[PDB]
Design a protein around this ligand. Structure first.
Ligand SMILES: OC[C@H]1OCC[C@@H](O[C@H]2O[C@H](CO)[C@@H](O)[C@H](O)[C@@H]2O)[C@@H]1O
Length: 349
């Protein structure tokens, strides 16, 4: 078929599975969330918590699906249909190494639901406690062993792919042990080889030798807020792509529709990026495509705390908060606008 509606398997959408309901999970997990103290606000702050009631959730927006559970198979079905609408072929699943049966259940449910719609799943390896290259290797082995034969497990030219968030928290000399073909605990040329995509944050003078010396296969930028880092400044993407191509690296810039996290970080208003009825998303996605990249990542499907989600949101005013909403656009606008950009990306590929 050549309908201009098929999934794109070089488009990765960051997905969060940490939402809970009292009924399914015992608590409205993540809809309830601690409010962060101001890191520049001095001592004795008592910022409190967002309780995750119907009226007061830990987002500046409000989900069309309500305070859902990430463990609810019926929600997962709906999410996969939303991925199909968006044409996003890869779900990049947050992974916190919780070592708990409820995590294991969720991951299996997500893989199963994804496969019904021919969506693929890869893992976004988060900065879990004491993360280091040895336990990373062990966890990569575990994930490939447990899930590598699942039909929804993502591969690119035969290799799994992992995104590594805050990869700068680990020195290049440690990464080399895992990721150089000669490394002490290498995955290269083993059953557990994978494309390892590190987080490019700051200036080229720092990031270029970091990526080379660490032996990452590529890099991504994550942040949905333009200008938050050098890497999330889209005017740098042409030059970042040129460097990537020269050095055999895969650049996967991250694009998002906006940013606002002031319910959970009230002091963080300088990072707000307004959606402007889709014009912000359009500008960022256009820059990624114009840079000539081979793959794009989307921040985010459903990071509701940070206001970067493309998942449908609805107008809502409760007695506790007046939420933002998609304004003049309909609740599914960011899904269908993603599909528009996926088509432009494919036309360019
Ligand atoms: O997936 C990479 C990162 O994406 C942004 C969120 C971040 O998690 C931190 O922030 C959220 C709030 O937005 C907290 O709920 C988490 O516990 C964590 O501090 C991801 O690491």
């Amino acid at each position: 078929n050549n309908l201009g509606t098929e999934l794109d398997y070089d488009t990765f959408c960051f997905y969060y599975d940490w939402y809970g309901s009292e009924a399914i999970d015992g608590q409205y997990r993540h809809w309830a969330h601690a409010i962060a103290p101001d890191p520049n606000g001095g001592s004795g702050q008592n910022p409190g918590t967002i309780p995750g009631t119907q009226e007061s959730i830990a987002s500046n927006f409000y989900p069309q699906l309500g305070r859902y559970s990430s463990s609810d198979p019926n929600i997962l079905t709906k999410h996969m249909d939303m991925f199909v609408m968006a044409r996003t072929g890869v779900l990049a699943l947050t992974w916190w190494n919780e070592q708990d049966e409820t995590e294991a259940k969720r991951i299996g449910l997500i893989l199963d639901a994804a496969d019904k719609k021919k969506i693929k799943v890869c893992f976004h390896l988060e900065p879990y406690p004491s993360r280091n290259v040895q336990n990373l290797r062990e966890n990569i082995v575990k994930l490939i062993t447990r899930y590598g034969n699942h039909p929804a497990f993502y591969r690119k030219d035969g290799k799994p792919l992992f995104f590594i968030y805050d990869s700068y928290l680990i020195e290049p000399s440690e990464w080399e042990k895992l990721l150089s073909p000669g490394g002490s605990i290498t995955i290269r040329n083993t059953a557990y080889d994978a494309l390892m995509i590190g987080l490019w944050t700051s200036s080229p003078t720092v990031q270029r030798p970091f990526i080379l010396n660490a032996h990452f296969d590529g890099f991504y930028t994550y942040f949905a807020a333009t200008g938050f880092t050098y890497g999330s400044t889209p005017t740098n993407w042409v030059s970042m792509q040129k460097w990537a191509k020269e050095n055999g690296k895969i650049f996967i810039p991250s694009v998002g529709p906006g940013y606002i996290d002031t319910r959970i970080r009230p002091w963080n208003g300088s990072v707000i990026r307004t959606r402007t009825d889709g014009q912000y998303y359009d500008a960022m996605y256009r820059k990624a495509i114009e840079a000539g990249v081979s793959a794009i990542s989307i921040t985010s499907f459903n990071e509701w705390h940070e206001g970067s989600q493309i998942e449908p949101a609805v107008p809502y005013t409760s007695s506790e908060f007046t939420y933002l909403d998609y304004e003049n656009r309909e609740p599914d606008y960011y899904l269908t606008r993603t599909a528009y950009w996926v088509g432009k990306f494919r036309e360019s590929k």
